[PDB]
């Protein structure tokens, strides 16, 4: 309503929004599942 | 030896057939007859003005076909390979590459000549 | 999705856009001669989106709010001062002209991008190739000195050969008597004080410099003012122009691109008209910059970028 | 796009004639069933002497002498 | 250019290179250092105005003798010990020649001075790729030959590299300029320790890449290619100041920011290796490069310029420029410091 | 439509009749600026307005090339745009004035 | 082969010398640089040929390969030079000297 020129940005890409939050879920889910899985590696190759 | 023997021979029948039509005429010298020809005018400049080329494009392009020449002439060894799917692999890229530059530079308009 | 190599690629080529009338037609003429109403007519007629001449506030009118800004945002100039006072010593002249040159040039590049992306034409009044008229006639009258000549040839000179010439030049000649009369008619109180001079200047760069030059490239059409009204009879000229000259004839999708590319990003444009050359009519120092930058940072609506003013009325700025 | 192929086989059958045997060249040695024998007859040419192998008991298919029964044969290529 | 071209040109540009990198050949290593010298001479070339063509024609003609050079030396090896690598066996001046043409090639002190005016005479972008990019190549073969070369010759090339970058920025007005003194001073702080231990080379090569690249994007912010003209920052996009600040002062080497750790760590080599009065030349005169820095910092970001009227024009107008690229790299190249162990 | 012009360098027009009505309007309008007495002024006033009578009553383009007796449309376009251009340049000529300036005695005496 | 050798080296030494050495035409060092390459090319292929190492005959053939494309740029290089300013003198190409 207030620019002459409606701006480049005037709604969020939704496209972009959306895949940027599921891969930051991804991620972090990954990472957590790595991080366990590493754990039960070590201690078993170690004898916990 | 026996093609060393007929070079030489051939350069040296070019070389008497020189000097024999150096030699036997009879010769009348002056700055006239000696003058550059230019259909019965003086020239105007001389011919080692720069004279500009207008196909300097096709004849850097031609440097680049010769060398792919260079690379096509083993063929008639090559063929004589077991490994002849990997040698017609080879050949036929190579000329479709060559084909494909020619096609980009027909159609770029690289062919035409300056003006 | 920007335009781009992409955009290209996928499609949006401008050879594909452009049609019969999708030209560029430039209405000049000296002050009061009826470049309004024919640009109008002729855009009306033609199918082509007329543009108001450029003038201290078309960059205000033309981003953000679309409001005009205050003239220390706008160019700290003023014509009624050039007309009240033209040998000022702040150098109002040629902060103007200057200024008004620098917007030429963005309207002639918002022209060139409507055209290139979307194939309709438009018909301009004056252009950033007819705007030396003025700041030569200001030399020959002593309003501006040499080096800012120097400047401004400069700043044109690195601009302007970057852009595609107009397809066509429309003159309207009327003479100075007549330019004199119907500014009295008019009856702007400033305006008024212009010398005859100063109009005799701006004919005499018209029919020295700009017309010669002009016919190398483009298709010139003059007219005198009793053609110039009926608008359909210059209309009815450019319908049949037949356009086989100038720099048009040479493009393609590949250099429209680059030119497109050029001219979509505003600032690349005006890029040069800020080149660190420190004429004192145009410097405007520290302490002075730093506050009228802050000023106008702290107006509604260009605290942030267009999309992000919450004030104005901007939404889901946290996901954008 | 027949009549497009065909508009080109009028007015510039050079270029036609020239994708055509192209697309010959890459089709035939699919298609044909000859082209097992290139590569065979190759490996027949014999452009080295071929080393006798050291006889130890356990070699019962390679021959001993060169008009054994066992062992490669030409007869393909000599009944081509 | 046109798509097709682009994208020809451009896999030719990375395909040097990595055929370089990947080579076991000396041969094929040639043949990705005649892939790029080819490739990137239209990128030169490619606005077309005098000193765009003077500029590729310099660099066209160094870089031709400079590849000769190499296959010179590669030719000699292959002669000597009928294979195409470098060995133990390799003979001295082979191996010296190999060094001094690859340093032509870099730009190494005294092979410098094509640099800077190739520098100078092409667009932002194009620099930026020539001072990056293209010294992953050269440098690679070095480092695969690191226990052949001639400490004596790398030292004086390097310290010759450090003074004569160091006292050519001081000179210079001109962005591009600077930038190719700055990649002249790194390349010799890189080849400093190339006999020593090539990882700390790998890892000064990557820092200044890092800190390399966004400076040039922010010069290509706004095409500012003078001191003058970047001095309008404060003006035409002032949050970009304090990045270009720490930026400059890494580059320089102030100690907490990330572009110390090359220096730090490379005189520790150098000292534990017994290089101390060239690692002291070295520390010392790479002092000159802070000061042209500060002075940069003085003229963009400590002090205010005069400015135009015609840039409220440009205030007026919006930006996209700036890439999500410059923020990781800035931020990367500066507060990364912490991070030390893990670099190394 | 034609296809062609007989003429080399003639391109074909596809708006005959509005070209023509354009041009021979233009031409009588520029007329109108010259002086009443000029026998300029009015012969090509009675020329055009006879060829625009004609070209308003045949919309056909065949016929209106015979009754216009000037080869194709497109030669009588070109011949209405130097029409145009030549009143252009008389109305600064003005040669209705009176002779400039009188022979000497016999300069126009043959045989002398 | 030894004496062969040395004067090959000898001869690439000359073209590069008469490259280094400029002498106002762009095209003559052109040409010293077309000289260094057909030493080096003589070069391997006598070495080749005296190793009987019949598998590095390819590499030769890709010195010249690249040897001609990088002539070929060289020349188009001269091409723009020409244009430019009217000669392949090297005396005008100065104008990043600033
Ligand atoms: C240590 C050894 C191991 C190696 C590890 C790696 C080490 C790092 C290597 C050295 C790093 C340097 C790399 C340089 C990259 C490019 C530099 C450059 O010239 O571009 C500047 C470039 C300017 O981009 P821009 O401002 O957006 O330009 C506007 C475009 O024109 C916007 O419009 P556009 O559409 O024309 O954009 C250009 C277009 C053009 O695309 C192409 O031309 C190529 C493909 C065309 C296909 C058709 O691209 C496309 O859009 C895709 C086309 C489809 O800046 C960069 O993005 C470089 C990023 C920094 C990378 C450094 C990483 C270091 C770690
Ligand atoms: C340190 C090197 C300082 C170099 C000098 C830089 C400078 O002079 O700035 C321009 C200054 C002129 O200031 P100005 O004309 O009023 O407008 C500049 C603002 O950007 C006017 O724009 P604005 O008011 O719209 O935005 C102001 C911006 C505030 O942003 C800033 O301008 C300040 C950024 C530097 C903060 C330094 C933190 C110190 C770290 C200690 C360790 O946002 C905020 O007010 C709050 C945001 C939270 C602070 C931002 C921190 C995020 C980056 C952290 C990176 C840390 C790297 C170290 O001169
Ligand atoms: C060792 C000396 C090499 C030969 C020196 C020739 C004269 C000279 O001064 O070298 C410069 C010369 C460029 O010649 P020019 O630019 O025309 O100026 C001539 C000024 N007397 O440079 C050249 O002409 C190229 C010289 C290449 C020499 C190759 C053979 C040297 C044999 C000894
Ligand atoms: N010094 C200077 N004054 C200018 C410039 N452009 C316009 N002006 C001034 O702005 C005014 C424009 O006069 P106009 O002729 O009425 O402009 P217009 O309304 O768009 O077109 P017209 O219908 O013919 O009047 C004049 O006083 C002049 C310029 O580039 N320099």
Redesign the interface.
Known sequence: ?????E??????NWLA?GLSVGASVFMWIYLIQTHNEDVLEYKRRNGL | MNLYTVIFINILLSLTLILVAFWLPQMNLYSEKANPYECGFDPTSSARLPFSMKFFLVAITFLLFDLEIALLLPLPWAIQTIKTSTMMIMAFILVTILSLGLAYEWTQKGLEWTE | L?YG?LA??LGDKTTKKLHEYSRVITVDGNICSGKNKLAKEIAQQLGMKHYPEAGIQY????????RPLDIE?????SLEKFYDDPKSNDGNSY?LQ??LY??RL?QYADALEHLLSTGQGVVLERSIYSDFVFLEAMYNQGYIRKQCVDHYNEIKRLTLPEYLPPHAVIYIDVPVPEVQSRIQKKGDPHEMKVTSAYLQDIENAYKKTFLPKMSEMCEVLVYDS?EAEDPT?VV?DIE?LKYNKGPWLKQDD?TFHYLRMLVQ????V??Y????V?LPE??????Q??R??NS?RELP?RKY?????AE???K?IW?? | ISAFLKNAWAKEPVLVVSFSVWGLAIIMPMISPYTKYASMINKATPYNYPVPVRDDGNMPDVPSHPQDPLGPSLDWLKNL | ???IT?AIIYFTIFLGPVITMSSTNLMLMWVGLEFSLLAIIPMLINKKNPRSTEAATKYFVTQATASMIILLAIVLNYKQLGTWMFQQQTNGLILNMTLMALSMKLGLAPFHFWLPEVTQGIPLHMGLILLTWQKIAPLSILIQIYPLLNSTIILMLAITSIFMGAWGGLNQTQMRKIMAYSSIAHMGWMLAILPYNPSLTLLNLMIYIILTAPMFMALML??SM?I??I??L???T?AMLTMISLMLLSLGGLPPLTGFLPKWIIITELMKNNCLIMATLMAMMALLNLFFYTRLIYSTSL???????????????????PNLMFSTLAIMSTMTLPLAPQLI | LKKTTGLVGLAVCDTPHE?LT?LYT?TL?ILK?FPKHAAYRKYTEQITNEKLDMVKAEPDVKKLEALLQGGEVEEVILQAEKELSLARKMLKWKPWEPLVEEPPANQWKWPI | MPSTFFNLTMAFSLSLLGTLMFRSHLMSTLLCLEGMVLSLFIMTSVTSLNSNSMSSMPIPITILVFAACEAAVGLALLVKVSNTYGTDYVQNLNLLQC
């Open positions: 309503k207030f620019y002459v020129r701006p480049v940005n005037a709604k969020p929004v | 920007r190599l290209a690629i960059s205000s009118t033309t981003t953000g709010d679309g945002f706008s160019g700290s100039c902060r200057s200024w620098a917007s963005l009793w009879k009815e049949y590949w990003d505003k600032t690349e005006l890029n008209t800020t080149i660190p420190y145009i410097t405007i120092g520290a302490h910059g730093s009228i930058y106008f609506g970028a267009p999309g992000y003013n104005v009325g901007d889901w996901l954008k | 250019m046109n798509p682009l706004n095409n003078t003058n003209s001095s309008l404060w003006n035409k002032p002090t205010m310029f005069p400015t135009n009227n015609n840039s409220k024009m440009m205030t007026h107008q919006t930006k996209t420029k | 070209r354009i233009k309008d600026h």
